[PDB]
């Protein structure tokens, strides 16, 4: 009776009480249980009629199903989407997540589990305060809901309520003796979440609740997180707590000024200068107990300026934006230790802004520093390399000679990132294997664009030697796209995508120079993908054999003269002449096909299926497999 169950589920979802009563009319107890309780699949969601009625907030449907049909309020199903595949949630959890007070009241009166636990230990009170309704939270609390119940990451209801900008629910939770010193998975408390959320009222309620400030698992105070969030008012209220001593408050002021120095939406010279002036005055005022900051040695990526120790040094650079940005970056990475998550992103934004107006080299060195920091942080940088190859593509399009040591260092960063993605996809399971493979393919394509722009530049002998050495390293790493495409297959394939930015103007595939450089660096010319096509089957299907015949002929001769087997047979018994679809490529390859008795004998052996196992040299066995 799946059709009747589906009809009842649809009636409950749409709220049609008349249809639900008509479909439930004259039904036995077994039929009632089957129609009310069955899990139905719709829109990627597994839900029962009562669950789907509570999710849509149908009070009439819930009261009709619970007053007479006495359906048990312990149904299981999958609720919501967009990162929430929570299973086992009852109707109360759906009603609390969608902010429906009447449904929660009806379920509680009928006997729903107030302290129900889902798969990730999600209390319905947590969803109720997640939505932002005070009445539901109050009703659940008065109906014996345990706030202290948390998930596997130890996120209490106070934290999930403090993520959003709802003052009333967090205030009521604080009034109900919520623990403020609860620790999340990475040593985090609700104070960090309130600080990053930028709500002054939640932070002041927490500090009036004696939040017991403590650093996170990474090692930053919640005041530091508030400073990183470019929230001036959040930072300028904890000075009255009388527990930050003097070093913590001055370092928070410096961090807030640093965050003011570079932000996509919170960038302003005057406020940053004022805050840095306040920090400098507060640091240099006492004198006897002056707090001396430990200045790092000058990083070449951090310009040639080593901090601003003198007050007049800061006063004189008030009219320069770049020095302010540099000192903000230096103090930010000094306070955060240059190992935090949100260190590199302001550097990348500052580089992008610096590059938007034809200024290149300082952008390049800041991006290098950000790449180094993210590599030390074990963070993928596919987007960084992509935008950076875009920047060089724009440079080459504007006939600007790109500095070559930058290309060397960026290529070494690219091969390091590709190796990191390689062992990542080696260790990452099926949970995010698709995303890991997509990042891997993006890294491969970015390296190809970098090789193309390197071939479009002119460098020295030793510089070209180092670049080819790095390409040799990556070739010996032997990358493999999800379709088995080696490094050589992509360089000759016209199906390799190029992003919509200026890379289309320069990095156009197939490229003769890229393939020649790969073959000079010992690329596996006879490499076979999982499809079966070699590096020669892929090119000969090129659909533009005449307009750019030069970059087809050059790649064909470069492949053939190095190691290519012209007669190599793929998994579908297709010679490269067979997979040509072009007279130009077919006869151009035929001009390179040196006929050999070995190939004819291999074809004759394969065609009639002679058992060649152990009766020929082993190198001939794979040679027969070639044909």
């Amino acid at each position: 009776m799946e059709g009747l169950a589906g009809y009842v589920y649809k009636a409950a979802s749409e709220g049609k009480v008349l249809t639900l009563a008509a479909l439930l009319l004259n039904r036995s107890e077994s039929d009632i249980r089957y129609l009310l309780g069955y899990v139905s699949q719709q829109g990627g969601q597994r839900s029962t009629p009562l669950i789907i009625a509570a999710r849509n907030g149908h009070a009439k449907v819930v009261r009709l199903l619970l007053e007479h049909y006495r359906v048990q309020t312990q149904q299981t199903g999958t609720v919501r989407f967009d990162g929430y595949v929570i299973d086992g949630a009852t109707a109360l959890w759906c009603a609390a997540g969608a902010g429906h007070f009447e449904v929660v009241k009806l379920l509680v009166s009928h006997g729903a589990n107030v302290n129900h636990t889902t798969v990730t230990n999600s209390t319905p009170l947590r969803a109720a305060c997640f939505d932002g309704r005070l009445d539901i939270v109050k009703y659940l609390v008065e109906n014996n809901a345990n706030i202290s119940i948390a998930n596997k990451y130890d996120n209490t209801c106070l934290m999930i309520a403090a993520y959003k900008g709802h003052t009333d629910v967090v205030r009521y939770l604080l009034e109900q003796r919520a623990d403020p010193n609860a620790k999340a998975h990475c040593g985090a408390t609700a104070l960090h979440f309130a600080a990053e959320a930028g709500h002054i009222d939640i932070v002041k309620e927490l500090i009036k609740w004696r939040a017991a400030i403590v650093v996170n698992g990474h090692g930053m105070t919640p005041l530091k997180v508030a400073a990183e969030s470019c929230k001036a008012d959040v930072v300028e209220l904890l000075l009255s707590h009388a527990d930050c001593d003097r070093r913590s408050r001055i370092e928070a002021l410096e961090l807030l000024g640093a965050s003011f120095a570079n932000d996509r939406e919170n960038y302003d010279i005057i406020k940053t200068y004022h805050y840095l002036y306040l920090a400098m005055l507060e640091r240099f005022q006492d004198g006897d107990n002056i707090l001396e900051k430990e200045v790092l040695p000058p990083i070449h990526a951090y310009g040639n300026r080593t901090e601003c120790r003198n007050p007049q040094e800061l006063e004189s650079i008030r009219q320069d934006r770049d020095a302010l940005h540099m000192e903000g970056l230096i103090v930010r990475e000094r306070i955060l230790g240059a190992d935090n998550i949100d260190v590199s992103h302001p550097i990348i934004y500052r580089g992008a802004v610096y590059a938007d107006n034809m200024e290149f080299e300082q952008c390049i060195k800041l991006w290098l520093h950000a790449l180094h920091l993210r590599q030390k942080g074990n963070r993928n940088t596919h987007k960084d390399l992509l935008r950076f190859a875009q920047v060089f593509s724009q440079m080459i399009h504007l006939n600007e000679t790109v500095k070559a040591p930058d290309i060397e260092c960026v290529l070494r960063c690219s091969v390091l990132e590709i190796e990191q993605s390689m062992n990542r996809v080696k260790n990452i399971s099926d949970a995010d294997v698709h995303n890991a493979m997509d990042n891997y393919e993006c890294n491969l394509y970015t390296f190809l664009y970098l090789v193309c722009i390197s071939t479009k530049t002119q460098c020295s002998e030793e510089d070209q030697c180092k670049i080819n050495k790095q390409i040799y390293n990556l070739i010996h790493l032997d990358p493999r796209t999800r379709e088995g495409f080696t490094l050589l297959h992509l360089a000759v394939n016209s199906n390799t995508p190029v992003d919509d930015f200026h890379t289309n103007d320069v990095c156009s595939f197939p490229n003769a120079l890229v393939t020649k450089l790969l073959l000079d660096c010992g690329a596996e010319v006879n490499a076979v993908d999982n499809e079966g096509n070699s590096a020669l089957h892929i090119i000969v299907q090129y659909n533009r054999p005449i307009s750019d015949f030069l970059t087809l002929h050059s790649i064909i001769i470069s492949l053939v003269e190095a190691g290519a087997h012209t007669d190599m047979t793929n998994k579908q018994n297709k010679t490269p002449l067979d997979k040509s679809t072009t007279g130009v490529s077919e006869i151009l390859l035929k001009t390179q096909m040196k006929m050999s008795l070995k190939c004819l004998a291999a074809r004759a052996v394969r065609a009639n299926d002679i058992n060649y196992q152990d009766q020929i040299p082993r190198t001939l066995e794979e040679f027969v497999g070639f044909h």
Binding site: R264, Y349, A352, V353, A355, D356, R387
Partner: peptide, 7 residues
């Protein structure tokens, strides 16, 4: 423009 697509 590099600022627009930074996201």
């Amino acid at each position: 423009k590099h600022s627009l697509d930074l996201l």
